[PDB]
Homo-oligomer: 152 residues x 3
Amino acid sequence: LWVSPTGGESGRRSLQLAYQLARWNEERGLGVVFDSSTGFKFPDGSILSPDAAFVERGAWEALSEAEREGFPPLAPKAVFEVRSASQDPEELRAKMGIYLRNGVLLGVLVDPYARAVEVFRPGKPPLRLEGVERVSLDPELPGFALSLPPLW
Amino acid sequence: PLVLDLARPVSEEELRRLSELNPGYQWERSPEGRLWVSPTGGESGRRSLQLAYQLARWNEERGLGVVFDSSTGFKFPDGSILSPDAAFVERGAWEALSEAEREGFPPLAPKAVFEVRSASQDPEELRAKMGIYLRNGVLLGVLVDPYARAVEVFRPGKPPLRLEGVERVSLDPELPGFALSLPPLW
Amino acid sequence: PLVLDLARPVSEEELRRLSELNPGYQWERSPEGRLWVSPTGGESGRRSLQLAYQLARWNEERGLGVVFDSSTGFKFPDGSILSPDAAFVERGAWEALSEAEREGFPPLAPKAVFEVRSASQDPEELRAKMGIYLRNGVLLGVLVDPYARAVEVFRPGKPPLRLEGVERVSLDPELPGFALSLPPLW
């Protein structure tokens, strides 16, 4: 069926994910979290917009007002992509590669359909989990664990 | 936003594709059928996230409906496809939709919508957008202006309420027991 | 600038139309056919006028060509249509054109173009733009940064020069007798 990354289901899922990341950041304040609309300007020149992003406090603080106002010129420490029916797995997997190649330190891919999650880190093979309720995202995001059932 | 005039109303298919081809940009269809485009920079993105977070937190503890983030576009009665920074839809209204309707731009007016003024947006255009929401059936429209540190609440049949330098804002009874905290949005 | 992919090259016609409907912005066409939208006005607009005025003043004295402010867009061989903050076109070239060409987006590369960095522009993106000007025939590209209070000069086949702490920059031989004064642009 006709699906849009900017449609209801995708929006409902990305908010559920972003909500958790924000809940965690509210208590720890180690960085700044952005929603699915945010565009970031990556080192390779392109603009990319994940479903959620976390940028380390130190990286964010180094930015000027103008840089924070526009598409931030940096690779977020962590990026999250929630697969929507309109996207084929290998495509996002390919995108996770692009993120890492640009300096993202943690890429999390959630597939609500397959009901799995894939964790991408540089200099390490991709990790795929299925059947787990929560997934620890330490050490990149200290004390944060992503609860999966809410994303389904 | 920037207006792109077409001698043809942009289509839902074209909106999806434009979103795809332009990460970081929000595409919308006006009531007259024109294209509206606005970028979502870092500041906008952190504020809308924080606003959606508060709405979601409230909803998780209450369970009255469904919350959507800022990338979601809704299809209203007059044909416009608008994308607020946050929206709340009651369960009943959401469930009534077909799997296809939920997956595409939901054909309904969220009970409550939120818009956060970005630096590149003129205040009056955004206040006007609030009127479009209301005339299409939205029961609560909230406009946050982080630059003036003010918030304006719009309700059908009521004078818009503009509050300045306040810390909290009760959005009862449309959103039972929810109070939006403003400093986190500055 | 805001880069927009309409999934097809934007036509010259649409560029004008878009400028009309969105007056406070500059509209250009990239070599790939995408839309480049940039903010107009503010102190940046003021700097543009100051520069064009220094140029017009010099040209009045020498009479070698035509001066343009930030409002003109030029059509280059690669199909891009760019609008610098100011430009100089040699008299002969200008007249060799058709009245229509002179009235729209002149189809020629100015001998010299000037770009003044505005607050939302990345220095590296402006430098790449200078690269586009030169590969399309511009003989002298000048980039003014009022924030870092520096100037960069680009000539084909030569390394880019950056000057700081200077009050004036001579632009011979391309603009004989012309020295750009910087403080007025800060």
